Amino acid sequence: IVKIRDLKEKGKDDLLKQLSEFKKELSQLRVSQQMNVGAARLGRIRTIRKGIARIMTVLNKNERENLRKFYSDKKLRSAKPKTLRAKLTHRRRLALKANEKNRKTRRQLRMAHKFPRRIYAVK
Amino acid sequence: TKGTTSMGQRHGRTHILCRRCGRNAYHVQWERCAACAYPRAQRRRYNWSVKAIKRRRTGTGRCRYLKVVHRRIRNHFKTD
Amino acid sequence: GRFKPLAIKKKYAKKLKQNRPVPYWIRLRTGNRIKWNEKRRHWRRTKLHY
Amino acid sequence: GTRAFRNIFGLDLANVNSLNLLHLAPGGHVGRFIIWTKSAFEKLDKIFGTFTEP
Amino acid sequence: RLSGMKHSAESWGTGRAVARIPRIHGGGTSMSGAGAFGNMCRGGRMFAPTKIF
Amino acid sequence: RANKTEIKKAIRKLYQVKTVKVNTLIRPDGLKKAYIRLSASYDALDTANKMGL
Amino acid sequence: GIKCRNRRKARRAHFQAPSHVRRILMSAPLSKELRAKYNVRSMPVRKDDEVRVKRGKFKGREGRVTACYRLKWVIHIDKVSCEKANGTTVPVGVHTSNVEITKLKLNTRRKAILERKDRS
RNA sequence: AGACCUGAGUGUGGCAGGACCACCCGCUAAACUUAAGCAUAUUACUCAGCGGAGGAAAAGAAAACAACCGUGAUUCUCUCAGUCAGCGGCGAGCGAAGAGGGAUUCAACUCGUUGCCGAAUCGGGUCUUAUAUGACCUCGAACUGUGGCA
RNA sequence: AACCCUUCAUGUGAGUAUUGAGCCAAAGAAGGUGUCAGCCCAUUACAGCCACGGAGCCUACGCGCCUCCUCAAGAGAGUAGCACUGUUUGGGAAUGCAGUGUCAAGCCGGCAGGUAUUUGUCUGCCAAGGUUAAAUAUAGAGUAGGAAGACCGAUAGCGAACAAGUAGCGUGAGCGAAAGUUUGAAAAGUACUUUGGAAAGAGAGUGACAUAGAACCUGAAA
RNA sequence: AUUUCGUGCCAACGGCACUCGUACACGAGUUGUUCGGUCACUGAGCACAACGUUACACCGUUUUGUUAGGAAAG
RNA sequence: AACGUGUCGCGAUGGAUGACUUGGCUUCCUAUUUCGUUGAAGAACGCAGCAAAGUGCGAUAAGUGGUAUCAAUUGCAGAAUCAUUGCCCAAUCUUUGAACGCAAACGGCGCAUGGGAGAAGCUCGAGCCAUCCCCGUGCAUGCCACAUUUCUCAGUGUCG
Ligand SMILES: [Mg+2]
Ligand SMILES: [Mg+2]
Ligand SMILES: [Mg+2]
Ligand SMILES: [Mg+2]
Ligand SMILES: [Mg+2]
Ligand SMILES: [Mg+2]
Ligand SMILES: [Mg+2]
Ligand SMILES: [Mg+2]
Ligand SMILES: [Mg+2]
Ligand SMILES: [Mg+2]
Ligand SMILES: [Mg+2]
Ligand SMILES: [Mg+2]
Ligand SMILES: [Mg+2]
Ligand SMILES: [Mg+2]
Ligand SMILES: [Mg+2]
Ligand SMILES: [Mg+2]
Ligand SMILES: [Mg+2]
Ligand SMILES: [Mg+2]
């Protein structure tokens, strides 16, 4: 068995080694499955499969974290892989940005400043 | 001889399975589907068969991605 | 005959594996409603062609 | 003054303004046991009027 | 508004030794050749369907 | 989806044996079966015992 | 909040409840001695608890809870059993509202619940 | 040899197609049926066919009504009105608008043109915690006119 | 307790039922529990309490600092109009539009004013470029929630209360069912003896009931 | 499209019969440098690109040496 | 006599009726309300200890991760806050399909670039590894902007 809190600190080389041992142990379990096994040995197949998935989860997240840091600069902004960019709906990616939607001309700026909204009340 | 005897003269086949929809409606000789009109980009849709339309529309299958994106919209794309 | 595409061969393989009875332990579950496989197929009754 | 008299099963509450006929004659049959508060009783002359008084 | 009327039934005509009611098309279902569309038929449309107006 | 050349290289890595021939077939249920003949310097019975057969 | 003016909706919510909902629905009253001590009317039942049956064929029987069969809406009590034809002994299910709790298996989480529900 | 005009190839960054289609916008477009027959008429500017959006769409700021003691963008509702308006083998049938009471409403703006200026504009690169309505540079676009003031 | 008499037997499931005492109510609310439940369980409230919250929206146009910014002419041309043809409209000597031909004015301008033409007044507007919330639709759509009904009640109501657009049918476009697992509170789902190759029968046993024995509530007519 | 093989089995099915079975059940079986196909040819023919038409491509042309008002050779 | 007929008690055949109802139908309201080249909708093939259909999922395959709660899941196994349960931020996501390197009753065939394995051979068990083989990425058409340190061209077009 593995714990996700312990796999976090390990390096890539250590994680890649532990993956190979778990895959090898799984292969031996399948061989015994063809023969008669017994209930106890038939169990822990799911335990091994769960441990393999946990190592792959940590490996992928570390890789994606490194790529985000590498492209974390305004210089490239276009070499960044599309899968790393923020995904929204297709319509939301094209609609209009916050700064583009509220653009005002010089005349519009002056008129708004000259005649502002007021709150008055009566009587 | 147009009845029982003529049933023994039917040898080949007009249609095979379709790559886009299945349904065994791909005309072998004409190379097009009678159910989805493949390889035309648009598929068939006629308002004189609303029963046929409701057989093929969205929600009759898996909606593998639509389920994900609908949940993301409900939660206003919460992240990190 | 001898000739068949590999895609067609795979479809026939799936139908072979489907043609089997319901396991006995399924009938003993709480709130079971299945007694026998309703979708059994025989090569002389229904064709399915392909 | 409703809070104390609610939750009592079999007791009905009413407002002297907007009296309901479906409540005053249940099933179409007239004659219902009505308890009047003093303030609501004194308002009947104004709400419905008298003879020779709109 | 569509209840009981979602078939492609039609009358067999006269000369087939059956009543002239419309009958369901097709085969292999035990519904084939059954009466359809009438207020007296099983699974048919009722007489004067109710409306919301 | 594996081919003969990949199967031969995988066998050597897993069990540390040298082969002389690989023959494959696709079973009627969709699985792929392979017959692997080892070199004369390697005992198939000894390898099977180590595997646990 | 299952009960509703819609009988059809209330019954669907009850009989399709998930496992964590069924834990709350399967609750039993506390005994008089426990009520005088913890000042709580009732608590959900759990394994290793001691109960006394109050309604049914087994009246006055006491035992320790062996299982909480949430899929069958019943609990199992030791010494509450029936004999099969072969002589095998099988447990008999009892609804949780027919029993009362006499002893609680205390725990740091269970103690937190009791302090939450303390009326005083 | 060098410009300008017109036109190609490649590279860098982007977009279109398909689905859904109840409601909405644009086109195309019947016959059964009624007229106790039927051809104009009716069904109907409907069904079927093609194209295109949204959370609503379309409409919308007078080349508008009226003829009064005058109203004042659009949309919708009651009513005007099955109309002593009108169309029609004047047959069967069909058929609106202004005004009036309301829902909503701080609802309104600006390109071109005219007059005064004439790159003050745009793209790209760099700097300022910043792909700033900022600054500097730019034989890059733009004088066959981008922008700013009345 | 079944033609009549005698002996010997065997037979009543679970209290939400009845009676007598109480108690709560700012809660009497309708679901569950072996029979009809305010007090067996879950619910029923702020006249509330906790943690989370990256974008967005709202709040002295929320609140500081730096940076920036601000305080005489003309008016849309293959356009409008006119002729012919077609369509459309309640629009009738021609309501709107389309095709082709022809094709303006602005020095007493142009368009509209529901009977055609020429002439003169009066009234109201200023086409041939663009954007724009709210009140409106959802007549076989979606995504999450809610509220219900003088509706149907398994040949009804959606085709589908069930592994239903499934099984099945057709070369294909397409067509398209039947079927409540409703035994019992609980499987306690009949150990064991005997006949039989088996299926089963005869006994025994569980259960309040087995003429509730497994497509098992009730069990009509032909 | 598993009807092939072995072992078992006789409820239903093979319009009579079954101890038999292409029935039912549980397990097995199809091995290629040279065999057939693709790799790798043209034919009767088809119709992507390009162009044209159509209110609308879901239309037309596309082998008589051969696409396209036509700058298609990397 | 038999057959046949009629009435009553009991038993078959058949599945009506009653009582039940997690289903349908109809009306109303509320939202941080509306898919896709960042590869949709649909279609195929797979995944559980015992697993045919259905459900969930995709070689990390009846699930990995985060969060709240805590003792279950159950037919038989089997393990003993960490499971299960509800919700959701981080991920994986086979072959196809608008499907887009070229084709297609083919699990087929390329070009460019980066890796991997390698039982010949070479050099000193190790390092290079030819032929063959496997994997990742790019490569459709059309249209828009740009070549910012301003790319390469063509024309008996106009000038010089
Ligand atoms: Mg014929
Ligand atoms: Mg022939
Ligand atoms: Mg042919
Ligand atoms: Mg075949
Ligand atoms: Mg019906
Ligand atoms: Mg082979
Ligand atoms: Mg489209
Ligand atoms: Mg849409
Ligand atoms: Mg007529
Ligand atoms: Mg007539
Ligand atoms: Mg006629
Ligand atoms: Mg709009
Ligand atoms: Mg009309
Ligand atoms: Mg200008
Ligand atoms: Mg507009
Ligand atoms: Mg039905
Ligand atoms: Mg039906
Ligand atoms: Mg026979």
Ligand code: NA
């Ligand atoms: Na239409």
Ligand code: NA
């Ligand atoms: Na004109």
Ligand code: NA
């Ligand atoms: Na040819």
